[PDB]
Amino acid sequence: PACPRFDDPVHAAADPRVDVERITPDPVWRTTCGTLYRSDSRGPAVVFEQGFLPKDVIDGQYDIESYVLGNQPSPYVSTTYDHDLYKTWYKSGYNYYIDAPGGVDVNKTIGDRHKWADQVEVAFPGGIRTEFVIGVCPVDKKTRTEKMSECVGNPHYEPWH
């Protein structure tokens, strides 16, 4: 089955003050609805209550290539198509599982030749409300593996397809 499409390209946003017209270059929006992932040090006690909030929606770096290459504060919350990218971010103690519409497909938007194209990123302008955060798995730092008996579902997750 194909995915439902919301009319609002930032329907998912935790911070709706994000300014879609300030995004550069012109974004190529993700139209698939597979699970995405985010390595984050922040704990589920916080993420499940707040969602993923972006560092700066008003004065942050709205330029995608600038944000990818130099992680200045931005209106974006980064995620990945790649379940296993947490192995590269071993320091972050969690691999979050996300089921959210939309997002800017970084490689479709700025190409797949830049330094970080292997990150297969999707950038959420305005972040990601908790209802789109499936859950989380803690990461064992020494083996770069998920502690699967310690995964936790987000009580606020609301399936939508």
Residue numbers in the entry: 40 to 200
Could you share sentences copied from the article?
S. scabies produces a 200-residue, 22-kDa protein that is a single-domain enzyme called Scabin.
Scabin active-site residues proposed to interact with the ds-DNA substrate include Val109, Asn110, Gln111, Thr127, Trp128, Tyr129, Trp155, and Gln158 (DNA I strand); and Gln100, Asp102, Glu104, Ser105, Leu108, Tyr129, Lys130, Lys180, Lys181, and Arg183 (DNA II strand). The rest of the Scabin variants showed either a WT-like crystal structure or similar CD spectra to the WT in solution. All the structures were of high quality, ranging from 1.5 to 1.75 Å.
